[PDB]
Design a protein around this nucleic acid. Structure first.
Length: 1015
DNA sequence: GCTATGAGTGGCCCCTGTGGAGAGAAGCCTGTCCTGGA
DNA sequence: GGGGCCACTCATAGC
RNA sequence: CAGGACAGGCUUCUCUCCACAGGUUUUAGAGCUAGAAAUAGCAAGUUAAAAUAAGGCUAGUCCGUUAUCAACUUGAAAAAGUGGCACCGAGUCGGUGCU
């Protein structure tokens, strides 16, 4: 028999509940065949469970990293351009200078030339470091002096300016003096480069203050001198300079010291101003306009161009390189092979900063940038939507609000529809002359004045007309020619002008396109038009409203709004009327596009990708549940911190509804109407919560993971209750211990390792940053991420004698080696010293792979060297009820009688606490093996045994954190903190039972490792 | 008897900050309304 | 919040 | 009754592109004096280069952390196919009968 069965669902952010029940609230149980090589051939399981998986991630970080990579690449390209310009003369002075610049990061053993980067000899380097202690001194020297300097110093200064050219927030060239004063604290020192003067002044103040502080400290507190000037570990000056301490840390540490001594008034004031001992490369410099650097560059080039012809002949190139920037409406410069590129090319030469404007069509680039993201019209998927400020759109809005305005005058039996002449007269008299029009204004100015209807009753509008001809008023203010605005032949020209003013944002390109239409207006109008900008887009297309014409009458939807006779069909009525070809045109335009895959259709929805993942997982769960029951289709499907999580929980319902309804019923009747064999019911959680609260089925999110399954089961029960012993059946179902809980196996992806680059050490677990940079000499990354684990059976030459030893262990692959591993596993396994590879025994072990051990103890393979708790705790319902009522003993919100009775029930069964502790201890002994922590918990229990009941319950709820699924977590019990017990040994599972589970946990194949790899 | 290697227990660490431009989606209220059920 | 790493201590095989 | 559409305000979030300021790492910036060395005293400390996921071929001023992923058979892959039912009981499921 096709037993009537229903599928209930509870959809969360990371969990998917599923349940199958009969017509009488019972969950059938089946005997399932079990594959593998073990003895257990058949296992009986209930048709109830739940699924858990990791939260989905937004694509923000990948985009950020991509933008950063592009920043780095473009900066290096600019440096390469500068070296390309300079290299010709460099060979005549010192040909190996650029080699030394590139090869500085290596040790002296790996340097191909002398170790000194700048001059190549120690005397000149010392002289340079003495004469110019900081680069700002060299910059000021080149700006102010008239001396012929060595080209190397010029290159150094120019490269330093180019690599750190500063921001672009300010437009044009350079109350403003106050902004400069905030940027530039220099007062009167007469030079063209104030920034260098400010930095030098800060350096001098730092030097003098350091000398004074050394003097005073050595005078009065000799003992603290060592801490301040030698100890790198503390937040003192040594830490501020040679350590990692920040400025605020240094000020906070130095504040009490200066308070203890005299003569520190000015130093304390400077500390209050954050001006004491301040570096040159700080987080303050973000506010520097790039025009200062441009001016310094220009001054240096102007002063030095009289000695070096190539500097003079290439000054424009250098200024461009400093000032060149790719417009934000162009995008990446790729030849089609990049999925983010939309640039259109005039030719195929290499793009350089000196010829960018000739190769890339900026206008077409902006058009493609704007168009590729705009919505398409739903009714006509082949057309773009008009701008919201378009004239036809405003006319459509005004008339559509006016279309259903019904007017009643004295002597008229029924409300009448406005005539096209009336519509046009009203619009011309009020809307084209007033920005906002109310009902009283209409009554006074059209009915009373024009048609002499002194009293009129107007229905359909209460207060006013929200539509407005704002664009009309703006164009009348600019053009000041009503005849030009009212011309029908200029409607195309006006629409083109509006579209041009809406698409682009640059003044130059807007002028460029509108230059073809300057023949109609003066220069003042063109400039006034130039400054006008509009944003936003509509929801309808031009072709729908005024482009497609009814072949019988030739009218458009615009004409139907203006003049259709007594019918006065509005926008909703015009599309649904069968007398017009427009609805036939709509159905024809419903392109039978290639059926989006369920993945694609889910990916096409609105929300974070995590909710889409949840949708796909729920659909696959439903599909497998249907497959299990003999492919007989079901009757009914009943479906249901940080804010976005619950937002997505409420957002799931509708989409799950239409996707399930679409896939389920695919058969149409003889009239092409869909025969709906499946009923989709959406219910909000409040009804289920009320059902829970009325019948004492409390929900505790801290005990275990059966709450999802119970929520789904109650969802199905309550949903089927309205469309169609019972409480006894529910109570029997809820206390069932065997529930299918499944953890989804995953292959980890992401960054190769952590980002903190650590100093050099003598260890084998450091990762090089390049191909030829041994970490023992240069340090590197740490903590690589495990991709997945493979079981290997082979022989290893061990010991100093290199003796072959047959082995069986786990070797986890890092994400950096996944491609290398799957390219040729034999070569990779030979690389790590394993020989006589047993290819047939390679087993894929992703994260959360499950192993079964004796006494039912289970472990999930968290990584190549760590395990997680896999066994689940099952508690009787009475203990759950007692614990919940105890935890909210004083938080009960209800009638006094029931609250007092529940509190009395809590009072009576205090002996439950010992039973709860004993059962927790037994479960921990049997599956957790946490003897020391268990003893600590037991000792703490007896210690606080006189505490009030509610506090006892609150502390007990914390205990289940030790027994929950996943990685062990620390928890607090009264005043005691319990450390986390971590399993760092994976050897015990090499001879255990390996289990593969279906996505619902019913189909499974068991593999025993004790037989694999045997001699 | 000496040294080296695994094996358990406790402890410390994990890149940050902003500007400019656009497009879209969702939810909450008022007006105007439709499509299905019943 | 959760997995890699290190310092210290300690049992044991090789020798 | 549920869902849906167009306008007028309120809020929150998502997707794409263009820039800037840091931080980290190694090296360079002759430490001295006394002492055989361990070590003790003195002195100085603000800056610079390179890299910032290993790299790849389609060689671009491009791409590299989004999503998808139980097992077996066909398939390069996408993709497709592959596993009995009923009845009684319940500590991670057990028992009874049929096929």
């Amino acid at each position: 028999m096709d037993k009537k069965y229903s599928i209930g669902l509870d959809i969360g952010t990371n969990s998917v509940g599923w349940a199958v029940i009969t017509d009488e609230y019972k969950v059938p149980s089946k005997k399932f065949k079990v594959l593998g090589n073990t003895d257990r051939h058949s296992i009986k399981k209930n048709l109830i469970g739940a699924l858990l998986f990791d939260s989905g991630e937004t694509a923000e970080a990948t985009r950020l990293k991509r933008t950063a990579r592009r920043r780095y690449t473009r900066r290096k390209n600019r440096i390469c351009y500068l070296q390309e310009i300079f290299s010709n003369e460099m060979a005549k002075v010192d040909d190996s200078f650029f080699h030394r610049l590139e090869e500085s990061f290596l040790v002296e053993e790996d340097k191909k030339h002398e170790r000194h980067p700048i001059f190549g000899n120690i005397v000149d380097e010392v002289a340079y470091h003495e004469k110019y202690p900081t680069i700002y001194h060299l910059r000021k020297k080149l700006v102010d002096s008239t001396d012929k300097a060595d080209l190397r110093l010029i290159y150094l200064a120019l490269a330093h300016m180019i690599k750190f050219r500063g921001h672009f927030l300010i437009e044009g060239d350079l109350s403003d003096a106050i902004l400069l004063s905030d940027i530039l604290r220099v007062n009167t020192e007469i030079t063209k480069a104030p920034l260098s003067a400010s930095m030098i002044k800060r350096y001098d103040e730092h030097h003098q203050d350091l000398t004074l502080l050394k003097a005073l400290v050595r005078q009065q507190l000799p003992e603290k001198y060592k801490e301040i000037f030698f100890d790198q570990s503390k937040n003192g000056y040594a830490g501020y300079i040679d350590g990692g301490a920040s400025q605020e840390e240094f000020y906070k540490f130095i504040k009490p010291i200066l308070e203890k001594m005299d003569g520190t008034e000015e130093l304390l004031v400077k500390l209050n101003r954050e001006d004491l001992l301040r570096k040159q490369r700080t987080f303050d410099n973000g506010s520097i306009p790039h025009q200062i650097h441009l001016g310094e560059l220009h001054a240096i080039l102007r002063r030095q161009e009289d000695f070096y012809p190539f500097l003079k002949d290439n000054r424009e190139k250098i200024e461009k390189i400093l000032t060149f920037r790719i417009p934000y409406y162009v995008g990446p410069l790729a030849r089609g092979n990049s999925r983010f590129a939309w640039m259109t090319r005039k030719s195929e030469e290499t793009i350089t900063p000196w010829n960018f404007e000739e190769v890339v069509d900026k206008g077409a680039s902006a058009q493609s940038f704007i168009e590729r993201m705009t919505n398409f019209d739903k009714n006509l998927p082949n057309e773009k939507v008009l701008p919201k400020h378009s004239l036809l759109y405003e006319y459509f809005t005004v008339y559509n609000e006016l279309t259903k305005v019904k007017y009643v005058t004295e002597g008229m039996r029924k409300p009448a529809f406005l005539s096209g002449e009336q519509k046009k007269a009203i619009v011309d008299l009020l809307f084209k002359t007033n920005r906002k029009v109310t009902v009283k204004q209409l009554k006074e100015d059209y009915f009373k004045k024009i048609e002499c209807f002194d009293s009129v009753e107007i229905s359909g509008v209460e207060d006013r007309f929200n539509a407005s001809l704002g664009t009309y008023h703006d164009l009348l203010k600019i053009i000041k020619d009503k005849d030009f605005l009212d011309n029908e032949e200029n409607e195309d020209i006006l629409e083109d002008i509006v579209l041009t003013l809406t698409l682009f944002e640059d003044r130059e390109m807007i002028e460029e396109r509108l230059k073809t239409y300057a023949h109609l207006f003066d220069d003042k109008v063109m400039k006034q038009l130039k400054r006008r900008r509009y944003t936003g887009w509509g929801r309808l297309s031009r072709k729908l409203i005024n482009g497609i014409r009814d072949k019988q009458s030739g009218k458009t939807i615009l004409d139907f709004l203006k003049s259709d006779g007594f019918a006065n069909r509005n926008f909703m009525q015009l599309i649904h009327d069968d007398s017009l070809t427009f609805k036939e045109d709509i159905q024809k335009a419903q392109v039978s596009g290639q059926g989006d895959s369920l993945h694609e259709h889910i990916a096409n929805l609105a929300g974070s990708p995590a909710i889409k993942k949840g949708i796909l997982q729920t659909v696959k769960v439903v599909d497998e549940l249907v497959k299990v029951m003999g492919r007989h289709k079901p009757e009914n499907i009943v479906i249901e911190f940080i804010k976005r999580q619950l937002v997505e929980t409420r957002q799931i319902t509708k989409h799950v509804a239409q996707i399930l309804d679409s896939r389920m019923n695919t058969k149409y009747d003889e009239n092409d109407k869909l025969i709906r064999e499946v009923k989709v019911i959406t219910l909000k959680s409040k009804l289920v919560s009320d059902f829970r609260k009325d019948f004492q089925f409390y929900k505790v999110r801290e005990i275990n993971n059966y709450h999802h399954a119970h929520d789904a089961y109650l969802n199905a029960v309550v949903g089927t209750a309205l469309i169609k012993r019972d409480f006894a059946t529910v109570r029997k179902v809820l206390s069932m211990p065997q529930v299918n809980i499944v953890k989804k196996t995953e292959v980890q992806t992401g960054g190769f390792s952590k980002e903190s680059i650590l100093p050099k050490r003598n260890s084998d677990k450091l990762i090089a940053r390049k191909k030829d940079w041994d970490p023992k000499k240069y340090g590197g990354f740490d903590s690589p991420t495990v991709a997945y684990s493979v079981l290997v059976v082979a022989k290893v030459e061990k010991g100093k004698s290199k003796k072959l030893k047959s082995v069986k262990e786990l070797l986890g692959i890092t994400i950096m080696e996944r491609s290398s591993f799957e390219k040729n596993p034999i070569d990779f396994l030979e690389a790590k010293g394993y020989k006589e590879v047993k290819k047939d025994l390679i087993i894929k072990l992703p994260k959360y792979s499950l192993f079964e051990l004796e006494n039912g103890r289970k472990r999930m393979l968290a990584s190549a060297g760590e395990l997680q708790k896999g066994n689940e705790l099952a508690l009787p319902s009475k203990y759950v009820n007692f614990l919940y009522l105890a935890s909210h003993y004083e938080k009960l919100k209800g009638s006094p009688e029931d609250n007092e009775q529940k509190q009395l029930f809590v009072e009576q069964h205090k002996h439950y606490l010992d039973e709860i502790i004993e059962q927790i201890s037994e479960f921990s002994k049997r599956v957790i093996l946490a003897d020391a922590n268990l003893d600590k918990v037991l000792s703490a229990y007896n210690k606080h045994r006189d505490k009030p009941i509610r506090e006892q319950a609150e502390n007990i709820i914390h205990l289940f954190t030790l027994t929950n699924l996943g990685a062990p977590a620390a928890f607090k019990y009264f005043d005691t903190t319990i450390d986390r017990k971590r399993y760092t040994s994976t050897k015990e599972v090499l001879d255990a039972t390996l289990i593969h589970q279906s996505i619902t946990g019913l189909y499974e194949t068991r593999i025993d490792l004790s037989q694999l790899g045997g001699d």
